[PDB]
Amino acid sequence: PYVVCRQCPEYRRQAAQPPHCPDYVCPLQGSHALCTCCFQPMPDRRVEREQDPRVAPQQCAVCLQPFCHLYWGCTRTGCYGCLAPFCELNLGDKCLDGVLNNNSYESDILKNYLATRGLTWKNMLTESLVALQRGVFLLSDYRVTGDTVLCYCCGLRSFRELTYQYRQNIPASELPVAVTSRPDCYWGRNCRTQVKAHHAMKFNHICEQTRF
């Protein structure tokens, strides 16, 4: 497959197939990788970076897929910045929608909580990463820290787990009584019925599955 990118030399440019009519520079043995987000080609220098950290990262350190943003800046509609240290990752203005169990009702309660106190999702992530670093909050990708270079999707995933733990350590008296009144769902946070408006509103799903 023939490949011409932003850092490709000018002779590669002119050699490509013509369209149909009605400080790097990639070497001959230079490969290209495809940014997972924007779909465009960049020179694949990941193996070189392995013994030359002077090279900008070109992959998420969790999923291990490649991304251009840190290398030379990505651009696409919906791309907030697809690679960053976790603590600086741009999660987008809508990162709190369904952030709790993909459950809008629960998410909204969290939203009101933060609005009421003038807190942003950034403030909340900042507190959360501090709990994480102490071992007070936990992650599935258990080795992730605020300094991890990762992607939009991976950061978001871990963001939801931190957020859940944040919501969890809010005291009942700091929430409206309409919220606290609701009884726990027997099936807890993983309940499948909570994506139906009526049920989400009727039961509290910030809880664990009932056993005994």
Binding site for Zn ion (CB under 5 A): 5, 7-8, 26, 35, 37-38, 60, 62-63, 68, 74, 79, 82, 151, 154, 185, 187, 191, 193-194
Instruction: Kindly tell me which of 55 and 63 has the beta carbon lying closer to Zn ion.
Output: 63
Q: In whole angstroms, how far apart are CA 29 and each of 11, 56, 65, 168?
A: 15, 20, 22, 53
Smaller CB separation from Zn ion, 124 or 151: 151
Nearer CB in complex with Zn ion: 154/162? 154
Instruction: Report in angstroms how near the CB of residue 7 gets to Zn ion at its nearest.
Output: 5
User: How many other C-beta atoms can be found within 10 angstroms of the C-beta atom of residue 70?
Assistant: 17
Residues 13 and 3 sit within 8 Å (Cβ to Cβ): no
- Please give the Cα distance from 167 to 107 (Å, whole number): 9
Closest contact distance (angstroms) between CB of 118 and Zn ion is: 31
CB of 147 to Zn ion, least distance (A): 15
Which residue, 18 or 183, has its beta carbon nearer to Zn ion? 183
The tokens of 52 are what?
């030359």
Cβ neighbourhood burial of 23 (10 Å; 0-12, 13-18, 19+): exposed
- Token pair, residue 116, equals 């009421």
Nearest distance in Å: CB 89, Zn ion: 11
Residue 157 CB, shortest distance to Zn ion, in Å, is 8
Cβ-based nearer residue to Zn ion, 129 or 154: 154
DSSP string, 86-104: GGG----TTTTTTTTTT-H
